[PDB]
């Protein structure tokens, strides 16, 4: 078993974390367990504070910050967990003083936007930062020599049981009925659309347009909704004034073509990595009390132009490892 670690400049304190990928189960988020090794040679008026910051960038704004005092340990505190904070303490059996945090169940996941032609040090998005620093008091200024900062992210995977089969139909009017293969799709799976356009009018369908669209609601941006097409399909299929057309199509979203677009959401990046399109956000029971970050959803579109359109929702996320 391997464990991640990081140290401050001047080598005074060091922070250990077992992973920087915390799965957010739909019922309870995973906890963050870390161990701090420090040497109090003359730390008479010095205390160790470990913080967990969830911030939204553009200047930045945070809605969940916390502070945990590791040394001197607070009396009547909780027991450390045996998964990490027992083996780590056994290895550093001299001054290993642990810390722990718990994440509220309704915090947004780590999703970053695509910057495009301009760089601002770090791209827009939501990121979780773990900052551990020694200081005389919590309210006083601390400089980079005394602070350890490590970036983590929160993710969630696909549900085990698939949902109902998506389908949507609309309307001597013409009738169009569409369907997908299944409810949940992965990041490389081809999204097939079943199409049937029975006609009774004299207006013939000229061109069938199908696209996959990514919806990213930003609550902090005055509840703005930005949608972009991540897939495009154009087969130029026409039907007779009053005929019956049934066909299967195929689409596959990918980042290579969408790199040109700006403001498009991507998965959490540790440092300037390449990541897939942002996964869907699973909201617990529809209680939309989260007002911090961004939520991503995907809906397929099927459009017909005469000489009407239906939208089919689905989810796009990785399977459980």
């Amino acid at each position, epitope marked *: 078993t391997r464990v991640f670690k990081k140290a401050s400049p001047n080598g005074k304190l060091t922070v250990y974390l077992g992973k920087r990928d915390f799965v957010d189960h739909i019922d309870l988020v995973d906890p963050v367990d870390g161990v701090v090794l420090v040497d109090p040679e003359y730390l008479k008026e010095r205390r160790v504070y470990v913080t967990l910051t969830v911030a939204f960038r553009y200047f930045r704004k945070d809605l969940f910050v916390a502070n945990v005092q590791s040394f001197p340990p607070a009396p009547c505190d909780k027991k450390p967990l045996t998964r990490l904070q027992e083996r780590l303490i056994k290895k550093l059996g001299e001054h290993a003083y642990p810390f722990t945090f718990e994440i509220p169940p309704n915090l947004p996941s780590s999703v970053t936007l695509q910057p495009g032609p301009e760089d601002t040090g770090k791209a827009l998005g939501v990121d979780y930062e773990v900052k551990a620093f020694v200081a005389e008091n919590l309210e006083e200024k601390i400089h980079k020599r005394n602070s350890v900062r490590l970036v983590i992210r929160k993710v969630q995977y696909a549900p085990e049981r698939p949902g109902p089969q998506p389908t949507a139909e609309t309307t001597k009017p013409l009738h169009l009925e569409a369907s997908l293969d299944k409810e949940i799709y*992965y990041h*490389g*799976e081809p999204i097939s659309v079943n199409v049937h356009v029975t006609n009774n009018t004299n207006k013939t369908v000229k061109k069938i347009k199908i696209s996959v669209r990514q919806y990213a609601d930003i609550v902090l941006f005055n509840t703005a909704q930005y949608k972009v097409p991540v897939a495009m399909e154009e087969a130029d299929d026409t039907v007779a004034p009053s005929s019956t057309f049934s066909k299967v199509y195929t689409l596959t979203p*990918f*980042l290579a073509n969408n790199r040109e677009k700006r403001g498009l959401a991507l998965d959490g990046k540790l440092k300037h990595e*390449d990541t*897939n399109l942002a996964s869907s956000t699973l909201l617990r029971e529809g209680a939309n009390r989260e007002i911090l970050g961004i939520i991503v959803s995907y809906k397929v579109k099927v459009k017909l132009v005469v000489s009407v359109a239906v939208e089919l929702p689905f989810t796009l996320m*990785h399977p459980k490892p």
Partner: antibody, heavy 116, light 106 residues
């Protein structure tokens, strides 16, 4: 499910060639296609690789100046145009697949077509 | 990054412990895979990652990592594992393979 390479050649030193690799069973955006080259009696030397989801390609040092890799998204096939020389005129070129997301190890392999 | 592997090793028909090591010249964070190539056939992936098996591989095969040192182990050698094994690292873009260790029957 499986990979089949339909390529092959017999080239005088300093010409051109073309390798094709048909893949049936998995998509080309959910997987990464690599070409591995085994000289007779020598180890497996890595050659051009393509990640169609991102669109960029890596090249070996000995092939960076001559080889060119491409993929056909319409039929799930990988193309490896060559301008081989004497040093590459004895090897057997494989076509193996790796998972696109969170893996780079190669799980499915082709039979391999000799190039000379 | 030069990945080095131990030379060919003998063996016995009756199952016995066989350890094959691959010494990485540069540190790789447990991103190492092991293969098996019988003569005249394509290599077969054996290990997903150091100490992690692959779907369909029997339970005898095992792996381990000791810093920059990796190891492949077989708990019991039946006469079907007599092939050659390659150690590969997939951390850096210039992917390299080991020289390959050929197991033989005595």
């Amino acid at each position: 499910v499986q990979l089949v390479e339909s390529g092959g050649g017999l080239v005088q030193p300093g010409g051109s060639l073309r390798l094709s690799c048909a893949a049936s069973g998995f998509n080309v955006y959910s997987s990464s296609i690599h070409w591995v080259r085994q000289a007779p009696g020598k180890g497996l030397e890595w050659v051009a690789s393509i990640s169609s989801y991102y669109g960029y390609t890596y090249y070996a040092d000995s092939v960076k100046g001559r080889f060119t890799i491409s993929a056909d998204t319409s039929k799930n096939t990988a193309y490896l145009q060559m301008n081989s020389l004497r040093a590459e005129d004895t090897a057997v070129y494989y076509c193996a697949r790796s998972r696109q997301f969170w893996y780079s190890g190669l799980d499915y392999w082709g039979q391999g077509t000799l190039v000379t | 990054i030069q990945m080095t592997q131990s030379p060919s090793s003998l063996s016995a028909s009756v199952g016995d412990r066989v350890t094959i090591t691959c010494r990485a010249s540069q540190s790789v964070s447990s991103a190492v895979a092991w293969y098996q190539q019988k003569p005249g056939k394509a290599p077969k992936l054996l290990i997903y990652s150091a100490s992690s098996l692959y779907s369909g591989v029997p339970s005898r095969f095992s792996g381990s990592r000791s810093g920059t040192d990796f190891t492949l182990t077989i708990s019991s050698l039946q006469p079907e594992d007599f092939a050659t094994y390659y150690c590969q690292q997939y951390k850096y873009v210039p992917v390299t393979f080991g020289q390959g260790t050929k197991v033989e029957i005595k």
